[PDB]
Amino acid sequence: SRGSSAGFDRHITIFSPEGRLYQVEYAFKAINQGGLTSVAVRGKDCAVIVTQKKVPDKLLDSSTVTHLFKITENIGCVMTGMTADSRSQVQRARYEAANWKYKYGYEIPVDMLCKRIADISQVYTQNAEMRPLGCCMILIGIDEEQGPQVYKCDPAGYYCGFKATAAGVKQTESTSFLEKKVKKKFDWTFEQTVETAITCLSTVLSIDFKPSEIEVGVVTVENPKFRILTEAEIDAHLVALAE
Amino acid sequence: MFRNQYDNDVTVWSPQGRIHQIEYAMEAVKQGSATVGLKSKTHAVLVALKRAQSELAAHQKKILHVDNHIGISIAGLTADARLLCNFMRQECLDSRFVFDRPLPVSRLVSLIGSKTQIPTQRYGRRPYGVGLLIAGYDDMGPHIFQTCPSANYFDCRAMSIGARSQSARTYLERHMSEFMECNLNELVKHGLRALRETLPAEQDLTTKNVSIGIVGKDLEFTIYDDDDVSPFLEGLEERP
Amino acid sequence: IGTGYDLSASTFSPDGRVFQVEYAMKAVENSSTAIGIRCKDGVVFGVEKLVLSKLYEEGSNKRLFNVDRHVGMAVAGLLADARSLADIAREEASNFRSNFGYNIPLKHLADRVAMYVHAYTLYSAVRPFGCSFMLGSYSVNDGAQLYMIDPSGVSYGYWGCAIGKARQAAKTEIEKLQMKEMTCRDIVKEVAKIIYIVHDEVKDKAFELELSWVGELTNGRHEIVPKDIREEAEKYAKESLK
Amino acid sequence: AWGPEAFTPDWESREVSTGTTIMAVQFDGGVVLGADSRIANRVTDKLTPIHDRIFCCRSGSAADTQAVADAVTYQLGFHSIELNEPPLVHTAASLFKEMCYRYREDLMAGIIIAGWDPQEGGQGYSVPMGGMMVRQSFAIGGSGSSYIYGYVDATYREGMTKEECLQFTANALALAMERDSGGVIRLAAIAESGVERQVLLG
Amino acid sequence: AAVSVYAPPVGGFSFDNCRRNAVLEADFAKRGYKLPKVRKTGTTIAGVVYKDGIVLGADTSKIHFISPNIYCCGAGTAADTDMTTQLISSNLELHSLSTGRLPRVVTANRMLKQMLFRYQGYIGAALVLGGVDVTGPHLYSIYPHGSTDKLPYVTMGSGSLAAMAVFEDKFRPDMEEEEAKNLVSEAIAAGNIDLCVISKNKLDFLRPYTVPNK
Amino acid sequence: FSPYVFNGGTILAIAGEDFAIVASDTRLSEGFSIHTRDSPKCYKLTDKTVIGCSGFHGDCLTLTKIIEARLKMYKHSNNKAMTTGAIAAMLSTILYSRRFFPYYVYNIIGGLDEEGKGAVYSFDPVGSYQRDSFKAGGSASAMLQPLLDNQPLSLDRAMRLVKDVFISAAERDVYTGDALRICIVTKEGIREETVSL
Amino acid sequence: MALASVLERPLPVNQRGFFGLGGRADLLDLGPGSLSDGLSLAAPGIEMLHGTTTLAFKFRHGVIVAADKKVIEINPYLLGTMAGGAADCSFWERLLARQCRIYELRNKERISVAAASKLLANMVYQYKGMGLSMGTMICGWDKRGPGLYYVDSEGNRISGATFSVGSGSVYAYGVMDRGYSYDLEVEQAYDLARRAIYQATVNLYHVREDGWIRVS
Amino acid sequence: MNARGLDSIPVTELDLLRKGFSCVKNELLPSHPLELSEKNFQLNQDKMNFSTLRNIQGLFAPLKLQMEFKAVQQVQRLPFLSSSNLSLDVLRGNDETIGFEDILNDPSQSEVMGEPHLMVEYKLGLL
Amino acid sequence: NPMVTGTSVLGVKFEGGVVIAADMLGSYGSLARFRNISRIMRVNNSTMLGASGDYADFQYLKQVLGQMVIDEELLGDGHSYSPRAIHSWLTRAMYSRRSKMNPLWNTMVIGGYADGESFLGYVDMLGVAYEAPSLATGYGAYLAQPLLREVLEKQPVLSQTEARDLVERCMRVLYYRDANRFQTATVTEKGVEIEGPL
């Protein structure tokens, strides 16, 4: 440690006169640096994750550019923000899930994983040597007694369970659209969940999508393993939506 | 004018992507005295110029002994030179004890660079302010290596470091094409003539301000001081 | 403008940026240009190596390392950091081979080294690395592969890459190649030609071309180009300059 | 003396063994892993699944072998998630060998590993006490390892059908168990399509 | 303040009286005296898995409590059994409070196994563990050296041979509750009697967990 | 598991007015079997000192390597080669460093002193040493010391005596070698020659 | 390697050549070391003094010690005797001499007999039961007059006017007990010591104001 | 497997009231087979986690864990008082389990304690 | 705790290099069912190694030595390990492991051909090392060393075919002592060639 900067704004362990930490808020602002948006919707018997896919160069290999990861055999993920921080947090989550399984003899639940990640992330807020990671994590999975589950955690260390959440630049508009849809009706099948998840992003960004511009991952009760849809299936869903 | 904030530590990058403390440490090499090192097809020679505090004090020694086939020359600080010399000696001793073979100069200099890179990245440290010239002999023949405070090393055929070494470098570059055929004589003479270019035009080289170190095919590292240097100085010309 | 928030690697700008990492990435553009092109059956590297003085040997301070029996590496930026990262990569490959008894896949090695690089941009007791590098490999069951890692810690797969002072012109020149349907023997000449075109002689006195490939010709091994092929490629590039 | 003659600690005879018998036999499409029963028990499963297509059988101290199996299952699952591919039997065998060799002076553990992978097909490895790692066409361990070795070696032939391999393994295990006991013999056939377990009684 | 202390102390077991006791016991045996001994329990215990629950039996209480759906029986050294059961019960209560739902049998089995293996079998406690959770009824058998074993019926104690013979003679998969109770009672008597019945119909797995009373 | 093995050998040392003689056999054995018939046990340390050790072979090798490393360290630190007495004191300290797990080696040091006369030192596996005029060690020391005691001399007569002592001792010992090596330390340097047995 | 240097605790995991639970880590450091001094931990023929007899007594004019070398000259003003293991006696008395010289250099005044005996006893007491065997009599003269102490490896440390250890201890002790006298001249003391050591079955020392001398 | 773990007699040539009642021979060997195993449980567990994590993922993970531990273990009370170890327990994963180190021989109620300055000097390495 | 002997390893020196023969048998104790395993290692272009004793330690040393060779050849500076360097490293490793009462139960034979001169060394678990024209360790160590010693004493200089025939006849005598398969390796100017099993 080389000391702590002086000011109500330049360090993590210094309270403002009004009683608020500003480095945490700046870490929150750091999420919008990527420029992408993510939407997660929970159905009657399924959970769906949809996100953008931007490939600017032509010499890039599009196979190696992705934002959907896999924690365990039955837990998915999607990250928004700084790429390196997202990957580091993914590795930490994998290690924590493996340790829980070894110690307790059965698979870790989604809420337990989210709580563990949030508890680890809170410690960086109360010490002068470490800094928060600029990313947010959304997990999906299926419980035994309960159905699908959607969870989200933020750099401040706060986590909650939702019915339909979003993150990124267009979070507010996505939240309003999802609120209207859920208030209207919630009983959805597998086809309806994917359709509404795609429609939210389409109508918020005002873009007619293409099969190679999005990536989708689903979890269903019949097949509880995380699965990433292919270009043909994405195109079929898009054609059905257009018709 | 705008540099005052970003030149107080080695853990801070300047807005132009430069570490100013490394460049400041590289300037301590030019605070010493000139040193010249060259090599031929068989031998490797080090020549150094010694200074004295006063007429009643012995001249400081510049050429040290590392092993039976490796020797170094110093230009810069002194404590760093002593620490590096201790490290070199320990590594050579351990290698000889374990494998019953001499330690190759390339491996030794790689170890030096790896050790020196560390204090330029972490807090609470400063870079080594010393530059070395290494002459050795192994299965690949003679070798001359140069070390920098920025943890950089080069494989040279003739090099000069210290204060006002540009003249020596110019002479070595001009006379580079004749080094690989000379025997020990005229090779020590080429080195001495190169070193003589760092002096004012009025004064010359005596036997109390020059040191010579030679290592060869079947001759171990030896240091010639004081009266042992006269045979090499007999044949020099009158500074043409 | 990030004045006041750019003295440590653990400080966030009011718009959510870390400026020390940005300065470290800016530092890479102070060195010469290195390119790498992936083709149908191999990967070939090329580095424009400046000459400091005539007193140095032929093989001094190279910029192409042998990480493993099947992996090459090309660097740009501060040299000492490049040596340190090469040592790290060698250690990782050796550890994997010792643990599991077969050659490490390229993607795993890239991930390991990228995470190690990223770990330095989190604490105030150290500073970010100041060098970028590329990795290349080939195997019968996987094919050619190429990756890049930058000081922030982000890695990606590429069909053709360029790092250094003049990456923009090099990328423009590369983007006019159908590298998917050619062979290493036909890519060495193109690499040499691009390097010669990009080089600027007004601000740089002289340079020496450095080349090496890995692929089916070398039977899955990273090797230096033979001297005659280097001479032929240089002659072709010089003729094409006219 | 002990210098020029190169004496050996002879791990396998540290204590007398009166346990069950375990065998793994390779056939064309995969591998067949079996174990017999020979106080209480008779309703116990002696086959421990390590992964979806990898199994193992244990010999020696119960607690030590169970702890080793738990740790190996941990490490293999973590590695498979990291590399994003189905695991190889060689990796599991190496993971067993590391701890079976480092703790040779503290634990009494003998492991045999059988499984299937898409790269090399059905494989069977032996890691006896001491840390040795050798791949074999057929592997025998336990108590009848000396009683039935000659018969198994003489009778064994090259890759046969799954049913013939199951019959051969059952015959060898029955001859091993009726040395002079129990009545329950458990078998498992591992192939690409999946494991196929069955129990023979009476 | 003591003048001979350099570092702060720690907790856990203490090994101060090891050598002193080692020589004292030898001297007392040589001169022929008596020293206090450790209390032991050796009464027979049993258990069986019927259609939709677990039945545990003991002879004279001796059936420990680990959770509303998990119970255990012990044989060996009384103090070790009590301590291990209490520690596992507290840890499982913390786990249930954190996770918000009833625990599982495999979790208790794993904790007990790892503890007993950690202490190298010097803590003598042979246990019979049984319970029911969302997956279904389960029954285990743990040993002092840290080796578990899953069976449909187990017996421990001095008179376990007759009980095992009775179970081998008259066991049938998926029997009724009364038949299981009668079988356990007869097996215990073949070697008063206490019976514990954990049934799926008396447990709700769709409600948030609340702390019970003790 | 015994970490000690006995190997045969026999060493001798005679100190003169301006010379020193160290001799030894050249056999390596393990009681019954014969390892090699060519293995001298005399090692040259500097231009004026020689050491001869016998016993367990691995300990002998380790001791010689440690001694050479320490000699190099002293030469680097003090800018001069160290004398015989300093070597003896350093070896005594090194030997006592392992009192509770000793080296199974018997050493004899011979060479010249500062004044230019012969010097002989004899040690024990723990480190006790003293200066003598002639000393015999090894397996056959017990049956060889009385002969020397009942029998300073010049170089030629001392060599004659050494030759007859070893030729008489070899025929009555089961560990003596087939060749004899003699190292002569004088003011002009060191020379050595091998005598067949 | 800068992140690993910050953590001021070198673990085997952070070093090179690590794989599995162990690896090529214990086979890396095989050098001969740089500088230290320390006895090795516990796991042939050891020279021991068996047929030796010693004698020592103090009187008005100093301390006279005789024996049958077997007497260690620690200092010009301090004397010692060995009995048992020669190597242990030599090593520990060399350490005692070094300690006495350090004390004299620091304090500009010679050490006393009591302090030296206490230092030797403290050094040899740490290894009780390990296997050390030594018995020493320490003679000297300081500001409080002549001194005489007996130190062994069992922690014993006693002071007296007459001591004797050896094979012929009983006879010589009886002789010099019969012939003892505090107010004794130097010549009669020499005669008594010679007669006692003769009847025990010849060296002879004499400590004075300004250092010991050799008589015969 | 976390509980299974895998020539230092210096001579002063590099106060007896402070230290006493100790001999090298008795401390040469342990008194019980479980003594060293219990004294070094946490160290062995950390070593095992570091080994597996380094073998599977790489060098970065154990280095980051050690850096976090060192950073969080520098804001404690002075050694003559008792600390709570909240964030260290959270990072280490022992925030929801109770062992035998917590209910036996409470360190917060120890029967011996030395001088403050002496402990602070000993921790710094001066003594 | 009980001890059993190890398999036999033979070695002779001829004009152009060295010849080494080793037994294919697993072990003489309860591990007799692990048949048909090789015990001959090729280190580099001018060094080969034969082992006799415990197999796990042999595999561990094989791993370490192969990794060291790969590490040295990656640099490509023109320096390689000579047979004497391997001999010294093995001796130091054995002694260091022995000093901690955790030895490596092995008895190695090293042969090589560098600079036009052959090499033949011997290392055991206690750190005893030497060089001899012929070596023999294992079950018939005392029944084969004098035979090879006298045969080489009669003719100090031997050819390749004569050395191979002598090794074959010694192995035949050893099998005739107690009643199958073996393999032979040779180091010369061409390199290390291994032929087997026979």
The one-letter amino acid at E154: V
B partners (3+ CB pairs within 8 A) are A, C, F, G, I
Query: Which residues of D are tagged catalytic?
Result: 20
Chains A and C touch (3+ CB pairs under 8 A): yes
The one-letter amino acid at I73: E
- Report how this structure was experimentally obtained: cryo-EM
For testing the chain G interface, which of I62, I65, I67 should be mutated: the one with the most G CBs within 10 Å? I67
Residues of F whose CB is below 8 A from I129? 57-58, 61
**Is the preceding omega at residue I197 within 30 degrees of 0, hence cis?**
yes
d(CA A107, CA A224): 13
- Considering only the beta carbons, identify the residue of B5, B12, B13 that sits closest to C27: B13
Query: How many CB contacts within 8 angstroms connect chain C with chain I?
Result: 14
Number of domains into which chain A is organized: 1
Contact (CB<8Å) C95/G18: yes
d(CA B85, CA B93): 12
G86 is in an annotated binding site: yes
Distance from CA of G16 to the nearest CA of D (A): 19
Residues 6+ apart with CB under 8 A from A212: A53, A62, A231
Contact (CB<8Å) E107/A144: no
Any G CB within 8 A of B178 CB: no
The three state secondary structure string of chain C is CCCCCCCCCCCCCCCCCCHHHHHHHHHHHHCCCEEEEEECCEEEEEEEEECCCCCECCCCCCCEEECCCCEEEEEEECHHHHHHHHHHHHHHHHHHHHHHCCCCCHHHHHHHHHHHHHHHHCCCCCCCCCEEEEEEECCCCCCCEEEEECCCCCEEEECEEEECCCHHHHHHHHCCCCHHHCCHHHHHHHHHHHHHHHCCCCCCCCEEEEEEEEECCCCCEEEECCHHHHHHHHHHHHHHHC
Provide Rg for chain D, Cα atoms.
Answer: 17
Q: Which of C162, C236, C166 is nearest to C201 (CA)?
A: C166
Can you read off the two tokens belonging to residue G22? 């162990």
Contact (CB<8Å) C126/G6: yes
Q: Which of A36, A35, A31 is nearest to A86 (CA)?
A: A31
For testing the chain B interface, which of F67, F70, F72 should be mutated: the one with the most B CBs within 10 Å? F72
Contact (CB<8Å) D78/H1: no
What is the DSSP annotation of H39-79?
A: HTHHHHHHHHHHHHHHHHT-SHHHHHHHHHHHHHTTSPPPT
Distance from CA of E106 to the nearest CA of A (A): 6
The one-letter amino acid at E43: T
Q: Which of E204, E188, E170 is nearest to E56 (CA)?
A: E188
Residues of H whose CB is below 8 A from C99? 55
For testing the chain C interface, which of G16, G21, G27, G28 should be mutated: the one with the most C CBs within 10 Å? G16
E partners (3+ CB pairs within 8 A) are A, D, H
Query: How many CB contacts within 8 angstroms connect chain A with chain H?
Result: 25
**What's the Cα-to-Cα distance from H118 to each of F40, G38, H19, H115, H124, rounded to whole Å?**
59, 27, 13, 5, 10
Q: E112 phi and psi, to 5 degrees?
A: -65, -45
Half-sphere CA count of C190, side-chain side, radius 13 A: 23
d(CA I89, CA I96): 11
Give the start-to-end residue ranges of the domains of chain C.
Answer: 1-240
Can you read off the two tokens belonging to residue D144? 């009848």
Q: Contact at 8 Å (CB) between A20 and A127?
A: no
Distance from CA of F100 to the nearest CA of D (A): 24
Which CATH architecture group holds C1-240? 4-Layer Sandwich (3.60)
Domain that holds residue A167: 1-243
Distance from CA of E212 to the nearest CA of H (A): 19
Q: Contact at 8 Å (CB) between G69 and G90?
A: no
What CATH fold (topology level) applies to the domain F1-197? Glutamine Phosphoribosylpyrophosphate, subunit 1, domain 1 (3.60.20)
Q: Which of F55, F52, F58, F56 is nearest to F40 (CA)?
A: F52
Any G CB within 8 A of F69 CB: yes
d(CA I181, CA I39): 12
Q: Contact at 8 Å (CB) between D173 and D21?
A: yes
Half-sphere CA count of F166, side-chain side, radius 13 A: 29
CB atoms within 10 A of CB D29: 18
Resolution (A): 2.9
Q: A57 phi and psi, to 5 degrees?
A: -80, 170
For testing the chain A interface, which of D66, D73, D74 should be mutated: the one with the most A CBs within 10 Å? D74
Any D CB within 8 A of A93 CB: no
Contact (CB<8Å) B97/G6: no
Q: Which of I192, I39, I12 is nearest to I119 (CA)?
A: I12
Chains C and F touch (3+ CB pairs under 8 A): no
Nearest CA in chain G to I88: G30
CATH of the domain at A216: 3.60.20.10
- Considering only the beta carbons, identify the residue of F100, F101, F128 that sits closest to G47: F128
For testing the chain D interface, which of F4, F7, F28, F30 should be mutated: the one with the most D CBs within 10 Å? F30
Contact (CB<8Å) D5/I5: yes
Q: Which of E48, E22, E8, E7 is nearest to E184 (CA)?
A: E48
Chain-centroid distance, C-alpha B179: 19
CB atoms within 10 A of CB F4: 12
Q: After what residues is chain F interrupted, C–N > 2.5 A?
A: 151
Residues of E whose CB is below 8 A from D44? 149-151
- Identify the residue whose tokens are 């060779």: I69
What are the start-end ranges of the H helices in chain F?
Answer: 57-78, 84-96, 145-150, 155-170
Can you read off the two tokens belonging to residue D179? 């040395």
CB atoms within 10 A of CB I146: 12
CB atoms within 10 A of CB G144: 9
What are the start-end ranges of the H helices in chain B?
Answer: 20-25, 79-99, 105-117, 166-174, 187-195, 230-233
Any H CB within 8 A of A127 CB: yes
Distance from CA of B2 to the nearest CA of A (A): 20
DSSP state of F139: G
Residues of A whose CB is below 8 A from H53? 95
Contact (CB<8Å) F5/D4: no
Can you read off the two tokens belonging to residue B164? 């006002």
Any I CB within 8 A of F5 CB: yes
Contact (CB<8Å) C112/H60: yes
DSSP state of H17: T
DSSP state of G134: B
**What do you get for the CA distance between the two ends of chain G, in Å?**
69
Provide Rg for chain G, Cα atoms.
Answer: 24
Contact (CB<8Å) D90/C101: yes
Contact (CB<8Å) C119/H55: no
DSSP state of I106: B
The CA dihedral of E164, E166, E170, E173, to the nearest 10 degrees, is -30
Residues of F whose CB is below 8 A from G40? 97-101
**What's the Cα-to-Cα distance from F158 to each of F20, F134, F138, G135, rounded to whole Å?**
10, 11, 20, 41
**Angle of helix B166-174 versus helix B187-195 axis, rounded to 10:** 140
I partners (3+ CB pairs within 8 A) are B, C, D, F, G
Contact (CB<8Å) F124/G131: no
Nearest CA in chain C to D82: C108
Contact (CB<8Å) B94/G6: no
Nearest CA in chain G to B96: G31
| β-bridge mates for residue D123, sequence order | D115
Q: How many helices (H) and strands (E) does chain F have?
A: 4, 12
Strand (E) or helix (H) holding D71 = helix D62-83
Distance from CA of C155 to the nearest CA of A (A): 9
Query: Which residues of G are tagged catalytic?
Result: 52
Distance from CA of D201 to the nearest CA of E (A): 15
